[PDB]
């Protein structure tokens, strides 16, 4: 997940892309039908305000 | 390594003393015997030509598509591990045709393209860092041009120039020359002027780096440039390294700095080692210039790292007139402006302001296509520079 740093690190923009893919396949151009997701976290504040 | 010229610079006679003649004739006799010594043996033993046969066989042993790779380690002589072009490591066999001396761990190696082995070393392209700070020659500023500062020119002459022109003085009293010089004064006093003056009448590779480039973007690429700076200086024989605006390694904060102050400090702790560490030093003299000598760690200035501290004050009235004369020397004035009247324009003019007046005066004469500056030009020049 994460908060999508500005001025992050070299091997941290890559994890950002993976979030932007898990992010887009949730609610994007092709609505996902009959697939429900459950997520858990002990710190639901570092999450990007898009997830 | 070896020098092609200077076979025997024995100019001690410095005259028509016969001693010059005896040595010269000695080689002539040796040359005569060598002539028939080589050709004679070159007939009944036509195995190696040494001029066309020697080169020819090695080329066949070499390959037409000679490869380029990085030597990664030195296993026992005649054997080494060389990194292939892309990502592979090969336990190649070193051929004796190579000098076997330039095989530094990581420079370059030429390998055969089929049975890969060491065929020859390759000289390393001049890294862009060296060219960045390799000042060739100070364009125009001479040493009598500086003017004004007199007691302060002797210190720099006596620390970074005398030990290279007359070493005897620090050769008979057994005193090592003062290590470094730090120049400090108000903004604009000739600090850099004297800095580039020494580059003029010097015989050593001058390197210049401003304090602002010592602070970089990524962590660790800090006190690694400092290592590169002093690695280039050592590699280039005698050299004077000039660090300008040293008060930018903790006086100015930049967002590009991934690590904050804590990272900049480690740059200083590496610069501290490079000036006085338990490594050998060689011949490298550091000139540091700053406009705030009170804002830097008082260990970089500790005696031993930088020894002579030279203080640059605002120009004296008598020196102020000299500054105007030197800057206005090549100017066709209109025998109507008096230098002495403009000497007292503001309580303290740095001297860089003096050149600013004498340079904006010309721009104020170009606008009218006039090749003579009048009092009006200077009067409006003295107001457009040190007022707004």
């Amino acid at each position: 997940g994460g908060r999508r740093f500005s001025e992050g690190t070299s091997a941290d923009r890559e994890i950002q892309r993976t979030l932007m893919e898990l992010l887009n396949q949730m609610d994007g151009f092709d609505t996902l039908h009959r697939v429900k997701m459950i997520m858990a976290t002990n710190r639901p504040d570092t999450l990007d305000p898009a997830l | 390594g070896p020098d092609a010229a200077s076979k025997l610079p024995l100019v001690t006679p410095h005259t028509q003393c016969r001693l010059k003649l005896l040595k010269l004739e000695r080689i002539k006799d040796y040359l005569l015997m060598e002539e028939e010594f080589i050709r004679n043996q070159e007939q009944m033993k036509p195995l190696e030509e040494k001029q066309e046969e020697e080169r020819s066989k090695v080329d066949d042993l070499r390959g037409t598509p000679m490869s380029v790779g990085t030597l990664e380690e030195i296993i026992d002589d005649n054997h080494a591990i060389v990194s292939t072009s892309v990502g592979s490591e090969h336990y190649v066999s070193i051929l004796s045709f190579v000098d076997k001396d330039l095989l530094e761990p990581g420079c370059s190696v030429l390998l055969n393209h089929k049975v890969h082995a060491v065929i020859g070393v390759l000289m390393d392209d001049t890294d862009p860092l060296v060219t960045v700070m390799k000042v060739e020659k100070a364009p125009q500023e001479t040493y009598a041009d500086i003017g004004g500062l007199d007691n302060q020119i002797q210190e720099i002459k006596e620390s970074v120039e005398l030990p290279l022109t007359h070493p005897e003085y620090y050769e008979e009293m057994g005193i090592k020359p003062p290590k470094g010089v730090i120049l400090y004064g108000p903004p604009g006093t000739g600090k850099t002027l004297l800095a580039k003056a020494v580059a003029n009448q010097t015989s050593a590779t001058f390197l210049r780096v401003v304090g602002s480039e010592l602070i970089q973007k990524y962590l660790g690429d800090g006190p690694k440039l400092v290592r590169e700076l002093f690695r280039v200086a050592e590699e280039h024989a005698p050299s004077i390294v000039f660090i300008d605006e040293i008060d930018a390694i903790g006086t100015k904060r930049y967002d590009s700095n991934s690590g904050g102050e804590r990272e900049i400090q480690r740059t200083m702790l590496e610069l501290l080692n490079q000036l006085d560490g338990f490594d050998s030093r060689g011949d490298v003299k550091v000139i540091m210039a700053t406009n705030r000598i009170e804002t830097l760690d008082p260990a970089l200035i500790r005696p031993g790292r930088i020894d002579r501290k030279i203080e640059f004050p605002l120009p004296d009235e008598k020196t102020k007139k000299r500054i105007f004369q030197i800057h206005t020397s090549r100017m066709t004035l209109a025998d109507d402006v008096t230098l002495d009247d403009l000497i007292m324009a503001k309580d303290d003019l740095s001297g860089a302001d003096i050149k600013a007046i004498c340079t904006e005066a010309g721009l104020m004469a170009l606008r009218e296509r006039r090749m003579k500056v009048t009092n009006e030009d200077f009067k409006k020049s003295k107001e457009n520079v040190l007022y707004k």
Partner: protein, 346 residues
Amino acid sequence: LNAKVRLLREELQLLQEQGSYVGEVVRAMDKKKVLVKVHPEGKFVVDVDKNIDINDVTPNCRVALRNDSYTLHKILPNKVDPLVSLMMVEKVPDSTYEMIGGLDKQIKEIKEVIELPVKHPELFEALGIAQPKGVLLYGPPGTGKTLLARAVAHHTDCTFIRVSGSELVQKFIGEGARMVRELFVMAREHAPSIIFMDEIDSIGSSRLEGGSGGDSEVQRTMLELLNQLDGFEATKNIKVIMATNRIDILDSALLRPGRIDRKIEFPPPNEEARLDILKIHSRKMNLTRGINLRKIAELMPGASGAEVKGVCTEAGMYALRERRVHVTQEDFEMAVAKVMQKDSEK
């Protein structure tokens, strides 16, 4: 006809010899041998076919290798110059003195430090004044700082290299990319050049108070650059510039006299300036007869260069919502309402 049949019959036997690699020759070597770097593959030292003279084999360029006994075959078309790539990523629009509005006094003051010292040396030495190196252009955003800087870099036949960080393009200038004084390594190779350095990193509305921030990596650039063009620099044909919205926030070093030779002024256009600015950008649409532009200028008190070139373009758009083919007076008048009147707040 007999030859044509023969040629086409040998093509089948000809279009089977292995193709040729395409590489770049970093530096020529001795004994008619060159050192080339091949496409996605390692470097190679390769012999040269006798048909090609070693003199033609020059620094970076595109060559060919046979298939397995690599040997230069032909000097292929030249590769794109690395600097031109920088001018393609950054897209400072090309501009000329004609599309300059209201700035006549400033145009005169810019040609005296970037045009005269370049196109006419031996005139600045007739007074003994050292050539000016660096001009600071200030003024509100959109007033025309970049539009004039390019013009003076277009009418003097000098390359216009813009340095603004943008580490995306931080590979066409220097592979190492350690210190800013590497652009010079390419600046001195491209004849007289002007190193523009823009500003305005969303400043004036953010970072007003303290906390993080600090300095500006568009200001530290000259302090490095100007420190070299003032002494330790051989080629005296390189000159630098800034555009900044504020001259009171410049460091205490860039304002010391002797560093910046001239400080040009770019104020928001006055009435006689807005009309001329509007005229230039209005000669691009099918304007109707008798469009009173003097009335349009009055209606926009305060518009640097973009609130004006936002009334001409939006005027055309307003002529499209109606499905018309001619731009009328109402369209321009209704344009100022949106760009200026409706957008005045915040």
